[PDB]
Amino acid sequence: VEPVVVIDGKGHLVGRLASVVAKQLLNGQKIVVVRAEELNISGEFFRNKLKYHDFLRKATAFNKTRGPFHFRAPSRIFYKALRGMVSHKTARGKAALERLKVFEGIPPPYDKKKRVVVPQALRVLRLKPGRKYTTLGKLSTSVGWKYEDVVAKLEAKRKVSSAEYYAKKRAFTKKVASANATAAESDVAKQLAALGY
Amino acid sequence: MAHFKEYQVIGRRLPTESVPEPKLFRMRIFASNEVIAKSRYWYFLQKLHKVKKASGEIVSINQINEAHPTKVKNFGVWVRYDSRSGTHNMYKEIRDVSRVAAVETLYQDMAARHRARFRSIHILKVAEIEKTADVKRQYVKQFLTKDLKFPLPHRVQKSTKTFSYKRPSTFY
Amino acid sequence: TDSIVKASNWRLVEVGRVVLIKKGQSAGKLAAIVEIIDQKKVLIDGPKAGVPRQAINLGQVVLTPLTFALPRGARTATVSKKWAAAAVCEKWAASSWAKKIAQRERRAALTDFERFQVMVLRKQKRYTVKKALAKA
Amino acid sequence: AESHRLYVKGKHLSYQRSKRVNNPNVSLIKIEGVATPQDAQFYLGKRIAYVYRASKEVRGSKIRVMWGKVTRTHGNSGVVRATFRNNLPAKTFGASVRIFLYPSNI
Amino acid sequence: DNTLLISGPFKVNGVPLRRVNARYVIATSTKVSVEGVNVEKFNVEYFAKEKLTKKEKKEANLFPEQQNKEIKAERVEDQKVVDKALIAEIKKTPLLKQYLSASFSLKNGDKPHMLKF
Numbered sequence: 001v002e003p004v005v006v007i008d009g010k011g012h013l014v015g016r017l018a019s020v021v022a023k024q025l026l027n028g029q030k031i032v033v034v035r036a037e038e039l040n041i042s043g044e045f046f047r048n049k050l051k052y053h054d055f056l057r058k059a060t061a062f063n064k065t066r067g068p069f070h071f072r073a074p075s076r077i078f079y080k081a082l083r084g085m086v087s088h089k090t091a092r093g094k095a096a097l098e099r100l101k102v103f104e105g106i107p108p109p110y111d112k113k114k115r116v117v118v119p120q121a122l123r124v125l126r127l128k129p130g131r132k133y134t135t136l137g138k139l140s141t142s143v144g145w146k147y148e149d150v151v152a153k154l155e156a157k158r159k160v161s162s163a164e165y166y167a168k169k170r171a172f173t174k175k176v177a178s179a180n181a182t183a184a185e186s187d188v189a190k191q192l193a194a195l196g197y
Numbered sequence: 198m199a200h201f202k203e204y205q206v207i208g209r210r211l212p213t214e215s216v217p218e219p220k221l222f223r224m225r226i227f228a229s230n231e232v233i234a235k236s237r238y239w240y241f242l243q244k245l246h247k248v249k250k251a252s253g254e255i256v257s258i259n260q261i262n263e264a265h266p267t268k269v270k271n272f273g274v275w276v277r278y279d280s281r282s283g284t285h286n287m288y289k290e291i292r293d294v295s296r297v298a299a300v301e302t303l304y305q306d307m308a309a310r311h312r313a314r315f316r317s318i319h320i321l322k323v324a325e326i327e328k329t330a331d332v333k334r335q336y337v338k339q340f341l342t343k344d345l346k347f348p349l350p351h352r353v354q355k356s357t358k359t360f361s362y363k364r365p366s367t368f369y
Numbered sequence: 370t371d372s373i374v375k376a377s378n379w380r381l382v383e384v385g386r387v388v389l390i391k392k393g394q395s396a397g398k399l400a401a402i403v404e405i406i407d408q409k410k411v412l413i414d415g416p417k418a419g420v421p422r423q424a425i426n427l428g429q430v431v432l433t434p435l436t437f438a439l440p441r442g443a444r445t446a447t448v449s450k451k452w453a454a455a456a457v458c459e460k461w462a463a464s465s466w467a468k469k470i471a472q473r474e475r476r477a478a479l480t481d482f483e484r485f486q487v488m489v490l491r492k493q494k495r496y497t498v499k500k501a502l503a504k505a
Numbered sequence: 506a507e508s509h510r511l512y513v514k515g516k517h518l519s520y521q522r523s524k525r526v527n528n529p530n531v532s533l534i535k536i537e538g539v540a541t542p543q544d545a546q547f548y549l550g551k552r553i554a555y556v557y558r559a560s561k562e563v564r565g566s567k568i569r570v571m572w573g574k575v576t577r578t579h580g581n582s583g584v585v586r587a588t589f590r591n592n593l594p595a596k597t598f599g600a601s602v603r604i605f606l607y608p609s610n611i
Numbered sequence: 612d613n614t615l616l617i618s619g620p621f622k623v624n625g626v627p628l629r630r631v632n633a634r635y636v637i638a639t640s641t642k643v644s645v646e647g648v649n650v651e652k653f654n655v656e657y658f659a660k661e662k663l664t665k666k667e668k669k670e671a672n673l674f675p676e677q678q679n680k681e682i683k684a685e686r687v688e689d690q691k692v693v694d695k696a697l698i699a700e701i702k703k704t705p706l707l708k709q710y711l712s713a714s715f716s717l718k719n720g721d722k723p724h725m726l727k728f
Contacts, residue, residue, distance in 0.1 A: 001360075001537070005360060007360075011364075020359060024359075026598075026599060027516055027518060027535060027599060028516055028599035028600065028601070092598060092599075095599070096599070114362075116360045116361060116362055117360070117361045117362075117363070117364055117365075118359060118360060118361070119354075119356035119361045119365060120356060120359070122365065124365070124367065125353045125354075125365055125367070126353075129351055175502055176498075176502060178502075179498045179501045179502040180498055182501060183494060183497055183498045183501065186494075186497075188490055188493045188494050188497075189494065191490055192487065192490045192491065192494065195475070195476075195479060195483055195486065195487050195490070196472050196473070196475035196476035196479065197476070197487055197490075197491070267412060267414075267422045267423065267424070268442075269404045269405075269406055269412055269424075269442070292406055292407055293406060293410075293424070294406065294412065294424045298424070340405065340406075340407060344383075345383070345405060346381040346382065346383035347381060347382055347383075347408075348379030348380070348381050348382075349379070349380075349382060349427065349432070350377075350379065357540075369379055369380060369432070477725070477727070478727055479727065480639065480640050480641065480727055480728065481639050481641075481715065481726075481727075481728045482639065482641045482706075482707070482710050485706070485709075485710050485713070486706055489706060489709070506714070506716065508716040508717065508718055509714075509716055510716050510717045511715075511716065511717060512717070513717065513722075513723060538722040538724075538725075539722075539724065544724055544725075545724075547723065547724035548724065606637065606723055607634060607635045608634040608635075609633075609634055609635060609636055609637050610634075611637045611638055611728055
């Protein structure tokens with residue numbers, strides 16, 4: 001539908017965001033994911049810390065370097081979930097995966113572009129209220145991700161400027177509606193009203 | 198076992214020259230079609246009389262329809278079941294609109310709470326409980342209080358498209 | 370310095386709450402909750418709209434903010450008399466919801482030419498509004 | 506105007522296949538805006554074009570086209586099967602494809 | 612020959628009396644009256660071409676084909692008689708001449724299987 005779809009990761013359940021992201025890829029749809037730090041996993045924090053340690057122990061015994069690699073960043077974790085869902089050792093695998101970009105925070109370009117959500121992966125619409133869950137940033141920080149604070153900093157800034165943007169907009173669209181209202185009642189307006197506009 | 202109808206089955210022991218006109222026995226049977234209904238019939242008969250399908254005959258098979266299919270009704274239900282360790286009796290109450298709906302949900306319930314498959318159950322009795330206050334189970338009673346109302350908090354709308362431009366709201 | 374406690378003000382499943390059926394033969398149609406079967410099932414009935422008295426899963430319907438006086442367990446004719454009394458249709462018809470529904474139904478029935486007339490008309494309107502927004 | 510489009514957009518998804526075997530003779534197509542098999546019946550029979558580029562010019566062009574028709578719907582979400590004059594090249598899984606409004610029936 | 616005879620009108624959108632194949636056409640629901648437009652004259656032989664064989668082909672290709680084209684006056688007049696009549700009836704409904712002069716195209720969002728023409 002669009003040349004790039006930028007997804008606000010916040011409030012999405014790691015598995016189902018991945019499951020829809022992978023599909024879109026394979027079907028030709030480039031995707032960028034922002035705010036992987038605010039991604040969720042169900043199950044409380046300890047379970048998900050525990051699991052990550054289970055992953056942590058796996059390594060090639062003759063050379064921990066040639067063995068399985070453990071990435072700490074919320075984005076790289078998101079990427080792992082995703083890669084699992086692509087035939088990634090195939091050219092068609094690699095092709096699909098270059099259509100994808102994952103980020104912590106919302107860096108340039110994408111912060112002036114609109115981001116969307118994936119309702120079938122929205123935790124708030126999916127997890128039974130009561131169930132405990134884990135936020136990706138926290139989990140990541142406890143296994144060595146180094147940059148939670150810096151992202152928090154940059155995001156707090158970004159949020160300030162975006163609020164200005166929003167203020168100005170809302171201001172302008174108040175004028176716009178004040179216009180659209182004087183032009184209401186006109187001959188052209190009732191006509192448009194009769195055709196469903 | 199499916200979506201149930203209720204049938205009267207009537208059957209009766211082949212006539213003999215010495216005993217023409219044998220006794221005639223009926224059951225109400227909950228089953229999805231009449232082929233099961235008659236099987237089901239013979240299975241309970243062979244548990245009460247000397248008979249089997251080979252020496253008896255079905256006289257009649259008629260589906261019985263709910264008399265007041267839009268009256269909410271409080272049903273009492275009586276069941277015999279088999280567990281992995283032995284065999285047990287039970288009484289449950291089920292609020293619905295027809296015995297047929299009601300038997301439908303007994304079976305789901307027996308499956309879900311007791312891991313009872315259709316084979317392991319005998320419906321012993323299903324009867325509309327006339328006066329409230331003969332209603333004995335709290336999960337039904339709850340619904341018979343005066344002027345009853347309730348919200349349905351935390352609403353989830355089904356999304357029709359993969360991507361959404363908003364950020365939903367569960368208000369209601 | 371009074372206390373001030375939000376609210377959260379939900380539509381309630383209750384006898385006399387009107388509901389917009391979302392799926393089935395009915396669908397788009399309005400009906401009233403007559404009795405109330407359990408947490409998930411109610412008995413509805415929508416005589417004016419042609420919807421059969423029936424048990425239904427709440428999940429198949431979306432509660433409207435409308436309600437009217439109805440005796441719990443009121444039969445079909447009674448429901449018909451009470452509905453008309455309370456003039457629920459006109460009350461619904463007047464709502465943004467009802468109207469938005471009519472609105473998109475209308476857009477869907479446009480003819481390729483009518484659609485062409487809509488664009489000409491929008492251009493027209495834009496000229497003047499784009500002017501207004503510019504002068505104050 | 507700015508839009509000159511007379512086809513609905515679509516995507517070469519897979520070959521028809523099992524878990525472990527494909528059949529290059531039949532292609533599976535995702536048609537924009539078609540979500541059900543009922544919606545998708547409309548497109549049955551319509552003609553599809555996969556349009557592509559190449560270096561050698563030919564019949565006076567560097568643009569080439571493989572033509573096909575939609576043949577039946579496929580599963581529950583508006584996907585459609587199609588067959589082509591020659592089978593589509595498979596690098597094209599994920600590429601765009603055009604579904605014309607002809608043969609017309611409106 | 613099963614085809615449909617149509618016209619722009621030529622003065623409106625540049626399309627002449629022409630054959631068109633019924634399966635390549637979406638019939639809208641808008642309608643002018645055609646109840647005073649001749650048409651009797653117009654048939655299959657009326658669109659008789661003029662062609663040749665290998666020789667002719669190679670000639671037209673060998674940098675030729677410029678010695679033909681050579682229209683027909685009868686066609687230019689026929690176009691006018693038919694058109695003036697339709698234009699008469701088009702004018703009756705406002706915006707319809709403008710509708711006729713603009714091209715149809717699918718806009719992002721259009722779903723042919725849903726759309727009412």
